[PDB]
C-alpha cells in the first residue's frame, strides 16, 4: 500500500457507521489507518495493576481507520478545494472549503 | 447468435482416458506371458520380429547411397489434355503450372490420353499422340536451345 489518507483535527467530523452524530478531530496515524477523536465510547478493562487510578479495568477511548466521516461547512452541503492563478496566496494553499474559499 | 446449448455436430468424442477405477472394465491392460513393459517400454516402433522380420533379403538396386550428392538433372515434366482443354487463349506453361496447379519442369513433355483443341503450347519435347492431334488437326511449337 502507501501512506495516503487524511489530515489533522480542526473539526474533522464524526458520522454514523453504527455510531452517529458528528464531532471535532483529535489525532490520527496512517500505518494501519488507526486514530481517535473522543466520541466512540469503548472501555479497555486493565490488568492486576494499581499504579494508575487503580488496579484493573480501563476507560473511555475512540477507534477506527478507513473512510467513514466528513467536514464542516454549516447550512448547505460541502465540496472540495480548487487552485490559484492570480488570487490571494501565490499559486498554493487549501484548508477544507464549502465551495468558494472558506469553511 | 446465442449459447443455445451449442453441443456439437453429431460425431466426435474427446474420449479421454483416466488412471484407475472400479467401475465397468476399468483397471487392466491385456497381455501376460509376454514381457515387454519397461521404463523405456520398447517404444514401440514395429519391434519384435523374433525372426529378423523376414529381413534375410538384401539390396540390389545400386545407383545411390553414394555420399555428397545425388543425380542432378533439370526438371522432367510431361502431361495430359483432359486437364485444361478449358481455357487456352495461348496454351503456354507458367500461365499453366505457374497457375492452377503443377510444379516446375525445365524441359516440356506432353501426352495423357483424352482429347482437346489442338492449339500451340510450349513443347520442349512432345509425343506422337499429340502430333496427329495437333498436325493436320492441330498446333504444336518448339523447345529451348539457348
Amino acid at each position: 500500500m502507501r501512506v495516503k489518507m487524511h489530515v489533522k483535527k480542526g473539526d474533522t467530523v464524526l458520522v454514523a457507521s453504527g455510531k452517529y452524530k458528528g464531532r471535532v478531530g483529535k489525532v490520527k496515524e496512517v500505518l494501519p489507518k488507526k486514530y481517535a477523536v473522543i466520541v466512540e465510547g469503548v472501555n479497555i478493562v486493565k490488568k492486576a495493576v494499581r499504579v494508575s487510578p487503580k488496579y484493573p479495568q480501563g476507560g473511555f477511548i475512540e477507534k477506527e481507520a478507513p473512510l467513514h466521516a466528513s467536514k464542516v461547512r454549516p447550512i448547505c452541503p460541502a465540496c472540495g478545494k480548487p487552485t490559484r492563478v492570480r488570487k490571494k496566496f501565490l499559486e498554493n494553499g487549501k484548508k477544507i472549503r464549502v465551495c468558494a474559499k472558506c469553511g | 447468435d446465442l449459447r443455445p446449448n451449442p453441443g456439437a455436430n453429431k460425431r466426435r468424442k474427446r474420449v479421454g482416458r483416466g488412471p484407475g477405477s472400479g467401475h465397468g472394465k476399468t483397471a487392466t491392460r491385456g497381455h501376460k506371458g509376454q514381457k515387454s513393459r519397461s521404463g523405456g517400454l520398447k517404444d514401440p516402433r514395429r519391434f519384435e520380429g523374433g525372426r529378423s522380420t523376414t529381413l534375410m533379403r538384401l539390396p540390389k538396386r545400386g545407383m545411390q547411397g553414394q555420399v555428397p550428392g545425388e543425380i542432378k538433372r533439370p526438371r522432367y515434366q510431361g502431361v495430359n489434355l483432359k486437364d485444361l482443354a478449358r481455357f487456352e487463349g495461348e496454351v503456354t506453361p507458367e500461365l499453366l503450372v505457374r497457375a492452377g496447379l503443377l510444379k516446375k519442369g525445365y524441359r516440356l513433355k506432353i501426352l495423357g490420353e483424352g482429347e482437346a483443341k489442338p492449339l500451340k503450347v510450349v513443347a520442349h519435347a512432345f509425343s506422337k499422340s499429340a502430333l496427329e492431334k495437333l498436325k493436320a488437326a492441330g498446333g504444336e511449337p518448339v523447345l529451348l536451345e539457348a
Binding site: - | 522380420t53 523376414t54 534375410m56 533379403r57 539390396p59 540390389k60 538396386r61
Partner: protein
Amino acid sequence: PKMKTHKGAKKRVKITASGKVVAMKTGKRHLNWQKSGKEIRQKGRKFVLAKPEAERIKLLLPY
C-alpha cells in the same frame, strides 16, 4: 520427434500403386550354387503375406 525414415529399406522396396508391399527376393546371386548343370535362372519379385503391412510405414515421410 521427426522420425527420419530409413534409407536402406527404401534402397530396395516399393509400394506398387495398389499399396501392395512388393519388391525383390533372394536367390540367383550369381549362382552361389555352382553346378554347371542347370537351374539358377529362376528369380523375380514378391510381396509379403503378413509383415508387408508393417514395413510400408517407416517410409511415410520419404515415400
